[PDB]
Amino acid sequence: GMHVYESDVSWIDDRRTEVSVGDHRIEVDSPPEFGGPEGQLYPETLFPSVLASCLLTTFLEFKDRMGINLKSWNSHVTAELGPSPEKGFKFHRIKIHVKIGVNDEDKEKIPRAMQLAEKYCFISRAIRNNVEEIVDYEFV
Amino acid sequence: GMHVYESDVSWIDDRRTEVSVGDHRIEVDSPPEFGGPEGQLYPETLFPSVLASCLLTTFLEFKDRMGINLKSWNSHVTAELGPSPEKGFKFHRIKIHVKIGVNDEDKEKIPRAMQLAEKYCFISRAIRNNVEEIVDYEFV
Numbered sequence: 182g183m184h185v186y187e188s189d190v191s192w193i194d195d196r197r198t199e200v201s202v203g204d205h206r207i208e209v210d211s212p213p214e215f216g217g218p219e220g221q222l223y224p225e226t227l228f229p230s231v232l233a234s235c236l237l238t239t240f241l242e243f244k245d246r247m248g249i250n251l252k253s254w255n256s257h258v259t260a261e262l263g264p265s266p267e268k269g270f271k272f273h274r275i276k277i278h279v280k281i282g283v284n285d286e287d288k289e290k291i292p293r294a295m296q297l298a299e300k301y302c303f304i305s306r307a308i309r310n311n312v313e314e315i316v317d318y319e320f321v
Numbered sequence: 322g323m324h325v326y327e328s329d330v331s332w333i334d335d336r337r338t339e340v341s342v343g344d345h346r347i348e349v350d351s352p353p354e355f356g357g358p359e360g361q362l363y364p365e366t367l368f369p370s371v372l373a374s375c376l377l378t379t380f381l382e383f384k385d386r387m388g389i390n391l392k393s394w395n396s397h398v399t400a401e402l403g404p405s406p407e408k409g410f411k412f413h414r415i416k417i418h419v420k421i422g423v424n425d426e427d428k429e430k431i432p433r434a435m436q437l438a439e440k441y442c443f444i445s446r447a448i449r450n451n452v453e454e455i456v457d458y459e460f461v
């Protein structure tokens with residue numbers, strides 16, 4: 182009864198990969214700090230961004246469920262990659278700072294909604310205890 | 322260590338989000354099972370794909386380190402989402418099957434290169450204990 186999601190990932194050349202998902206094709210490379218090219222998508226930016234997308238889509242469920250009139254949501258993502266005590270690297274922290282536009286009458290529901298969103302977010306769950314995840318917000 | 326990676330993610334409408342990294346724009350939405358449109362990227366496909374891209378870029382660092390001559394690399398990724406004992410859902414398993422082309426003389430080095438790639442992959446590290454990760458390969 183699992184829902185199964187499939188994709189393909191190949192080596193182009195050098196430090197360059199191609200992600201294929203349905204009819205979409207994305208170049209995802211090593212970043213400059215590890216010898217890759219400048220100006221491309223990297224796992225280092227794409228993974229935290231997908232985290233922040235999943236957080237937002239989980240929030241949207243709770244937003245509908247709780248009758249919140251959401252006007253806008255913009256989030257800035259800051260991911261820190263650093264040394265692991267197991268050698269090599271790991272994500273130390275991923276910070277997601279959200280600017281939320283809602284009706285004033287809905288503001289009181291937001292702490293709960295945000296906590297729920299992060300709790301039930303599939304990617305948040307995936308990285309629990311291994312990466313510090315700091316989600317905060319301000320009303321605009 | 323410490324390197325900072327930044328992105329932005331906004332709500333478009335409905336269950337749709339836009340990822341911005343530099344000048345790159347990517348639509349990432351809930352899947353149809355969770356109220357998103359057909360034919361778009363979803364966190365359920367993108368996140369497993371970025372995991373596989375990270376496995377590959379880590380392997381590429383080790384193959385150069387070890388003098389392995391890599392001819393080709395193709396991988397198929399299957400992600401299975403299901404109910405969580407914590408309520409809601411979680412990724413249960415992500416499988417990555419790699420078809421690797423190498424010089425015959427390099428094949429004896431591949432078990433260790435793959436071990437190292439999986440061990441040091443930072444997205445693999447990020448999901449340790451929370452999602453089952455199954456990586457295997459065949460030569461082509």
Ligand SMILES: CC(C)(COP(=O)(O)OP(=O)(O)OC[C@H]1O[C@@H](n2cnc3c(N)ncnc32)[C@H](O)[C@@H]1OP(=O)(O)O)[C@@H](O)C(=O)NCCC(=O)NCCS
Pocket residue numbers: 235238239242246247297301350351352355364365408409410
């Ligand atoms: C929403 C969802 C978590 C509900 O889970 P469930 O297994 O039915 O469990 P529950 O009904 O207990 O709800 C989970 C929590 O949400 C709370 N909740 C649900 N609806 C609520 C509402 N209308 N108002 C306030 N709280 C609500 C519950 O009280 C519960 O709280 P708790 O964690 O503190 O115990 C689940 O259906 C889901 O994950 N759906 C996918 C959401 C989605 O679209 N995500 C994006 C995918 S890309």
